[PDB]
């Protein structure tokens, strides 16, 4: 499977849950999952059962989403952290006054860097983390993750679908080692 299980750190604050719902409704193949008391090893099992080979865990920073750690699911064992993003800030679709993509299943995510700066590295990270493609499909539908460099270690990410912005807008930063 190639779906993406999106969850939170344990006992998430309200905004973390809201963000996960917004993000999961925007990225093709992603779905929100309640963390409960599951260990990372247990999340791997729940991912397999649901045909997902990626686990995304949104951590907090004083009540706000503060980090996104992505894990690859290869077996029932504890999953490896393959990519991580620092969440500097986020605005939910509800706050940006726009909607969510009307998906039907089968759509793909395309990562598009707007400049040759650090946005290129983040685009590569999206390919690894969310199975995004750098090259758009010729006919199939797709959600576009537009990535712009704000500084040497930070980017702004805006998702687009059907010629319009959708989902949460993110400001992401590189951790010590984004792709390990």
Going by C-alpha positions, the residue among 69, 68, 58, 70 that lies closest to residue 16 is 58
Going by C-alpha positions, the residue among 167, 126, 122 that lies closest to residue 148 is 122
Residue 104 CA from chain centroid, whole number = 19
Query: What is the CB neighbour count within 10 angstroms for residue 69?
Result: 19
> What's phi and psi for 94, nearest 5 deg?
-55, -40
Residue pair 89/172 in contact (Cβ under 8 Å)? The answer is no
* Integer Cα distance of 94 and 115 in angstroms: 28
In the chain, what are the domains?
A: 1-174 (3.40.50.10480)
* Integer Cα distance of 81 and 111 in angstroms: 20
The string of DSSP letters for 133-162 reads BSS--SSS-EEEEEEEEEETTEEEEEEE-S
Tokens of 60: 């907090």
How many residues can be counted in the chain?
180
Residue pair 122/155 in contact (Cβ under 8 Å)? The answer is yes
Q: Which residue has the tokens 């980017």?
A: 155
Residue pair 96/165 in contact (Cβ under 8 Å)? The answer is yes
Give the torsion through C-alpha atoms of 132, 135, 141, 146, to 10 deg.
60
Going by C-alpha positions, the residue among 53, 62, 65 that lies closest to residue 21 is 65
Helices (DSSP H) in 6-164: which residue ranges?
Answer: 14-24, 40-49, 93-96, 119-130
This structure's resolution (Å) is: 1.8
* Integer Cα distance of 69 and 137 in angstroms: 27
Q: What angle do CA 162, 163, 167 make, to 5 degrees?
A: 75
Residue pair 86/78 in contact (Cβ under 8 Å)? The answer is no
* Integer Cα distance of 73 and 91 in angstroms: 29
* Integer Cα distance of 176 and 154 in angstroms: 13
108 by Cβ neighbours in 10 Å (0-12 / 13-18 / 19+) ranks as middle
- b/e burial code for range 131-167 (CB count within 10 A of at least 16 → b): bbeeeeeeeebbbbbbbbbeeebbbbbbbbbeeebbb
Q: In what order do the strands lie in the sheet with 142-151?
A: 30-32, 3-8, 52-61, 64-72, 80-91, 165-173, 154-160, 142-151, 108-113
3-state secondary structure of 93: helix
* Integer Cα distance of 43 and 141 in angstroms: 29
DSSP-assigned letter for residue 122: H
Q: Which residue has the tokens 């040759």?
A: 116
């Amino acid at each position: 499977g190639y779906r993406i299980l999106v969850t939170t750190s344990r006992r998430p604050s309200p905004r973390i849950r809201s963000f996960v719902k917004d993000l999961s409704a925007t990225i093709p193949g992603a779905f929100r999952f309640t963390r409960g008391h599951y260990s990372m090893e247990e999340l791997a099992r729940e991912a397999i059962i649901r045909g997902a080979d990626r686990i995304v865990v949104v951590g907090e920073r004083r009540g706000n989403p503060g980090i996104i750690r992505v894990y690859a699911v290869e077996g029932p064992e504890r999953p490896d952290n393959i990519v991580s993003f620092i969440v500097k800030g986020v605005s939910l679709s509800r706050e940006r006054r726009w909607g969510l993509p009307s998906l039907r299943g089968g759509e793909v995510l395309v990562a598009r860097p707007l400049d040759s700066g650090v946005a290129v590295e983040f685009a590569d990270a999206f390919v690894i983390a969310f199975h995004a493609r750098l090259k758009p499909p010729e006919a199939a539908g797709y959600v576009e993750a537009v990535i712009e460099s704000l500084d040497a270690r930070t980017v702004a990410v805006t998702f687009r679908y059907g010629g319009a912005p959708v989902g949460p807008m993110l400001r992401l930063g590189k951790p010590a080692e984004m792709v390990k």
